[PDB]
Amino acid sequence: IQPGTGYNNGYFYSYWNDGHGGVTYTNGPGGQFSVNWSNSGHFVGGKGWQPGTKNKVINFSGSYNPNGNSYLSVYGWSRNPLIEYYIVENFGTYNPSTGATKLGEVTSDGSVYDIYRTQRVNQPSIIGTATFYQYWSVRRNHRSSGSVNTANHFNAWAQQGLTLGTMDYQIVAVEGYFSSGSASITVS
Ligand SMILES: O[C@@H]1[C@@H](O)[C@H](O[C@@H]2CO[C@@H](O[C@@H]3CO[C@@H](O)[C@H](O)[C@H]3O)[C@H](O)[C@H]2O)OC[C@H]1O
Known about the structure:
Strand content: over 45%
PDB class: hydrolase
Number of domains: 1
Largest sheet: 9 strands, mixed
Bound molecules: a molecule of 3 linked components (XYP-XYP-XYP)
Main location: secreted
CATH class: Mainly Beta
Structural class: mainly beta
CATH topology: Jelly Rolls
Keywords: Carbohydrate metabolism, Glycoprotein, Glycosidase, Hydrolase, Polysaccharide degradation, Pyrrolidone carboxylic acid, Secreted, Signal, Xylan degradation
EC number: 3.2.1.8
CATH superfamily: Glycoside hydrolase family 11/12, catalytic domain
Shape: globular
GO molecular function: endo-1,4-beta-xylanase activity
């Protein structure tokens, strides 16, 4: 399937890419999706909710085997203000917080997370080309299955001045940046 959003087997999904090639996104039954990629471009895909909420407890399980630059995250957006956010549970060779401004720490679901804010300028977004902040929680202890109590992150962020607008979609996402890998993830 081509990039798009919609509902599949009861779950919202979003699949986006930069058009390069080298990535196959597949919707499985229930909350399952797979991503297989090799010599990809930049892409983000996964399943979840539209809209997300600020208290959702998100469960994910399966396999995540990146070869290079990739993230596995609870991923979503707010509007008014436009914010792209991540709770990064695992990643490949590149830490997305590299060179980023650290805004605190939070402990949640069995690990410490480091909190960051970054800036995107004239980049793709859920409202088209836009300039926006990104908020990050990066898990210290990598894992490919677990539960994320999102409120712990949103609250810690807010305490540190990283506040959100109205919630748009909220998914468990596999993101890749010009790399290879595989993932098979079930969301609930
Ligand atoms: O049809 C439009 C969609 O194409 C559009 O999709 C979003 C475009 O921006 C994506 O965000 C990037 C994902 O990768 C990150 O590293 C970057 O920081 C982001 O720029 C987002 O994932 C897509 O959902 O949404 C609007 C539609 O009109």
